[PDB]
Swiss-Prot record, chain A:
Belongs to the eukaryotic ribosomal protein eS30 family. The modification Phosphothreonine is found at residue 24. Component of the small ribosomal subunit (SSU). Mature yeast ribosomes consist of a small (40S) and a large (60S) subunit. The 40S small subunit contains 1 molecule of ribosomal RNA (18S rRNA) and 33 different proteins (encoded by 57 genes). The large 60S subunit contains 3 rRNA molecules (25S, 5.8S and 5S rRNA) and 46 different proteins (encoded by 81 genes). The keyword Membrane does not apply. Its main location: cytoplasm. Keywords: Cytoplasm, Phosphoprotein, Ribonucleoprotein, Ribosomal protein. It comes from Saccharomyces cerevisiae (strain ATCC 204508 / S288c). One of its GO terms (cellular component) is cytosol. GO terms for molecular function: structural constituent of ribosome. It is found in: Cytoplasm. GO terms for biological process: cytoplasmic translation. Present with 37600 molecules/cell in log phase SD medium. There are 2 genes for eS30 in yeast. This is Small ribosomal subunit protein eS30A. The lineage of its organism: Eukaryota, Fungi, Dikarya, Ascomycota, Saccharomycotina. Component of the ribosome, a large ribonucleoprotein complex responsible for the synthesis of proteins in the cell. The small ribosomal subunit (SSU) binds messenger RNAs (mRNAs) and translates the encoded message by selecting cognate aminoacyl-transfer RNA (tRNA) molecules. The large subunit (LSU) contains the ribosomal catalytic site termed the peptidyl transferase center (PTC), which catalyzes the formation of peptide bonds, thereby polymerizing the amino acids delivered by tRNAs into a polypeptide chain.
Curated annotation (Swiss-Prot), chain B:
One of its GO terms (cellular component) is cytoplasm. PROSITE patterns: G_BMS1. Present with 1390 molecules/cell in log phase SD medium. It comes from Saccharomyces cerevisiae (strain ATCC 204508 / S288c). It comes from the Eukaryota. This is Ribosome biogenesis protein TSR1. Residues 39-201 form the Bms1-type G domain. Belongs to the TRAFAC class translation factor GTPase superfamily. Bms1-like GTPase family. TSR1 subfamily. Pfam families: AARP2CN, RIBIOP_C, Tsr1_G-like.
Swiss-Prot record, chain C:
CDD domains: S4 (cd00165). InterPro entries: Ribosomal_uS4 (IPR022801), Ribosomal_uS4_CS (IPR018079), Ribosomal_uS4_euk/arc (IPR005710), Ribosomal_uS4_N (IPR001912), S4_RNA-bd (IPR002942), S4_RNA-bd_sf (IPR036986). SMART domains: Ribosomal_S4, S4. The modification Phosphoserine is found at residue 183. The lineage of its organism: Eukaryota, Fungi, Dikarya, Ascomycota, Saccharomycotina. Its main location: cytoplasm. This is Small ribosomal subunit protein uS4A. Component of the ribosome, a large ribonucleoprotein complex responsible for the synthesis of proteins in the cell. The small ribosomal subunit (SSU) binds messenger RNAs (mRNAs) and translates the encoded message by selecting cognate aminoacyl-transfer RNA (tRNA) molecules. The large subunit (LSU) contains the ribosomal catalytic site termed the peptidyl transferase center (PTC), which catalyzes the formation of peptide bonds, thereby polymerizing the amino acids delivered by tRNAs into a polypeptide chain. There is a cross-link at residue 179 (Glycyl lysine isopeptide (Lys-Gly) (interchain with G-Cter in ubiquitin)). Residues 159-185 are annotated as: Disordered. GO terms for biological process: maturation of SSU-rRNA from tricistronic rRNA transcript (SSU-rRNA, 5.8S rRNA, LSU-rRNA); ribosomal small subunit biogenesis; translation. Component of the small ribosomal subunit (SSU). Mature yeast ribosomes consist of a small (40S) and a large (60S) subunit. The 40S small subunit contains 1 molecule of ribosomal RNA (18S rRNA) and 33 different proteins (encoded by 57 genes). The large 60S subunit contains 3 rRNA molecules (25S, 5.8S and 5S rRNA) and 46 different proteins (encoded by 81 genes). Interacts with snoRNA U3. uS11 interacts with MPP10. Component of the ribosomal small subunit (SSU) processome composed of at least 40 protein subunits and snoRNA U3.
Amino acid sequence: EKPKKPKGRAYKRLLYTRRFVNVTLVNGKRRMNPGP
Amino acid sequence: KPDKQVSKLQRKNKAKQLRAQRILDSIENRKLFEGKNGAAKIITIVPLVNDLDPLDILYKLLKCADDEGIMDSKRIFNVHIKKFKSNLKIIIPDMTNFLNILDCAKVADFVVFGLSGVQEVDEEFGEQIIRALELQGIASYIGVISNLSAVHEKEKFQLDVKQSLESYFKHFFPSEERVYNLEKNSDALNVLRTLCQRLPRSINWRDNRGYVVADFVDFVESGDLVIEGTVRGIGFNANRLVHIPDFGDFQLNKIEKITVFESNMNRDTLDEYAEEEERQLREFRDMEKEDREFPDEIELEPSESAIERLKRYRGLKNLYNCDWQVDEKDPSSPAEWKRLLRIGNYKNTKNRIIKETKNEAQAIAGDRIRMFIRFPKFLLEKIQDPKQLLFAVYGLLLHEHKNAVVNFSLQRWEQYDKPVPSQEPIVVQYGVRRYTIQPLFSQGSNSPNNVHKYERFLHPDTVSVATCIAPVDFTQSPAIFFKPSPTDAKNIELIGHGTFLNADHSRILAKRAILTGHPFRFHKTVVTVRYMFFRPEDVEWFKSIPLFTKSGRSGFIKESLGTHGYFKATFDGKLSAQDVVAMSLYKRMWPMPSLPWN
Amino acid sequence: PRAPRTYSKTYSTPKRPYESSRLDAELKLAGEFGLKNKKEIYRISFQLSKIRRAARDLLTRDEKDPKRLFEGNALIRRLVRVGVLSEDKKKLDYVLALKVEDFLERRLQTQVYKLGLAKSVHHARVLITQRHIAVGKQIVNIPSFMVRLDSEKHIDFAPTSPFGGARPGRVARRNAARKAEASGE
RNA sequence: CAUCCAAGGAAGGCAGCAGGCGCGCAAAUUACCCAAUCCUAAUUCAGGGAGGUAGUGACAAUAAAUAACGAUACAGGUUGUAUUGGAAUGAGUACAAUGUAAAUACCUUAACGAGGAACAAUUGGAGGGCAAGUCUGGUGCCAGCAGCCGCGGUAAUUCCAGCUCCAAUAGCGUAUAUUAAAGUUGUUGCAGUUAAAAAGCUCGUAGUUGAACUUUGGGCCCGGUUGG
RNA sequence: AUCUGGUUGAUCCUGCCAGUAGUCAUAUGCUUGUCUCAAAGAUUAAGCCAUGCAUGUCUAAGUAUAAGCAAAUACAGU
């Protein structure tokens, strides 16, 4: 059902955009796996 | 008393003389196959695909023996390979009869598995052969291919296929990393050397008995049956019983070595004591779904006496703490009890019996023997030519003819999702013998009182214990469970596998029923309950049995209220209309008897 | 037997495994320059470690010691040739101030992006590995190739590829044929 | 120790190459060739399991694929999230030539060879040490987890399963030994009142160690190197 | 040229246990697409060995009547 994740070089490209663009700050202490 | 320091010399000397002992043992073990006077190794060929024809395998092997004089409308062969001074006996089973395949493999030293490079192994037959053979035990195994050229374009295309087959074979026999290609002389020679030079593994349950493969069979008149062959197991004694797989137990009057050993008759003897399918399947499918959600629940109804329906039952506080008596006098108990054998410590009895048996052995491995069996002459019509069909004879241990309460482990076969009702008859094979059994299922637990819950159906997932009355086995043989089904291409439905655990009569099984009712009015210290009962006389009669909610709270009856069988009760805490109130009643279950099967 | 073949390991692993500040700084480099591994960063810091060790040793020698003059000048000459060290900083004390970004800047993968030709460092890497870029006459398909200052004028598309002047590729040709077959009804 | 036999007799030494048994946690083909390197002989020519070639081979080492780019819709200060379109390429297969003693493979190349690009990356973790979950279902101090501190007896941040997330990545985990951490072996460089550790006391041989003093100062030429 | 967790009601110490990084150091588990290069029955048993092979050699120039081959009456090629 869900698509596969890319591998190698293309995966580091993905991580880079999470942590330095689409950040969630939650009282200034950014969090990586926020409980919904 | 003084402490001692090891000098270089005595260090050296001790290591040397320990090596000598090790070396003497290896010779001692290989002696059984030592040469042209020694025993033959028993090879069974099993093609996993109908394509193959087993005689093509045997042909390619003998080409490497470098003796055309070795190399026909028969299925058992004796061969001497002078190149290795080796004696072989080759057995080919008739691949039509699934049960006959298992029997030939049971006596083998090496099983040779044939694989096809052209055609895929079938899930419904080829796989089931491999899976089943593993679970009864295998002495050793070799993987072989014989038709690999049939896919040739270049040899590199052959190797792609061979790597696929090696991966497949290693899934079942992970100790093996190579599959031999018999179309290459070097590989085919490599296989032949292994069969001659290498010792097999033992089979524990087999080698603690005696067994022989018949060389000749003959009858003498009121009947007497003569067999001769080579002893392989722990050995035979003329005072012990003798099993033959299709015909049951028999007694022997003489042993002789090709000294004579008559039956001395201070011995034991042959005695055991001292469209409906659519409706039925749908019924179990519906019932098992219900019991999976609402186990053991029973409905009383209006205009029914709760007493006479249920007066048989006891009612108890907790299974793991009750003082239920073992040999209770209750009339449902089976007609045999003192007649049944009772053992106590199975472990200490088992190993003690074996230790004596090897000491009392009259004929031993490698002996040439003739055997005279007291055989009812009317069965003679069922004997087949031993050059076409495998005929084999097994020893019994002293008390293995006597019935007792026995327990088995059970878990489901690879993908058998069908419901299994507890009372339904099943066929069980353990060791060589097989019996029709009606089991009872329970979860394994460590109850200090040996009381355990009876269950209606086999759990979908966990291992569980099955109980019945059957003859004892002192070798803890593995067990395979199946039901006959002549519509299937192999006439058999495989259900599960496990092991013979012990003989133990102190195992108590409690059948359980649940009554249930609705709380509907609530007060700070009392609750009143509907629909569990319908007359005040019933409500009073059961008053002493404890109550529980399925939310796990506990309570007790106070008294009857009114005429319609309402009652009021007290509980640990705040119930509410979403809760249900229940009470359970217990009844002793006893094992059913069992019968031989064919 | 024949004499042994010599070989050596070319990278070194950091000694504290889960230091949060280091982990962030490394991921910024990988995203900026289009690397695939942390190993590609460990390789560069391993090289720089050896360079500092050599220079740090020579600086204990007396000035005009003949060894300091000979080996010191060679080391500087070599780093200027690839453009890691500026021709203004042509002194042994400035060698100690080099840092990892100065080496990453000279990889073929990043040069092919600064020149045009490619529109991202991720697009650049694919072109190199797919044999489209030549350096002078030679096709080069390794992204970590270090571009010497003389070579920069000569980076261009390879003669034997599309973009460089050859016939269209396999997929372009297939499409034209199938269309012509349908049009050549 | 051990082989053959006509029972009179005869023959033996793989810690050379390949191969077998045994042992054990623990280790490859009974293949091709003198073309190269060299050696021996009465010799340019013969011979060479010395040596070379290929097979098995995640011991260790180097380089490095598993996707790139537009349009459209929506959101936002040129960057994100999802409907759609052409391009590019080797893994693999193969005519040929090259390679080679003859071959296999590498390098080169006509034809063929991507849309869940199914031509689908794993191995360990998510209380602390130590990067990363008040998520959701189950269970009953039990099954289990746990290097250490500990968790679990319905209300589990630690068990089991599902989502999501983290780390290294064609590699990752475990056991045993050893190096650093260790100024917990201390020459550099430890400690001995009360925490482990100054011997009841004095004499004394080997060993280690042992106060101060003897030509100091002052003139005159030559004089090389570096710096201004 | 770097350390962190554990003795207490709480604190400062002595001290060890656990954690951390490497190994041209071995074994083993799971997984495995491409190019170059490459160790390999040492550890325990300097234990025992079926079969085949591993040492021979000639130039114009020591000895020729092969009843060998091939075509200058003592001989004369190979």
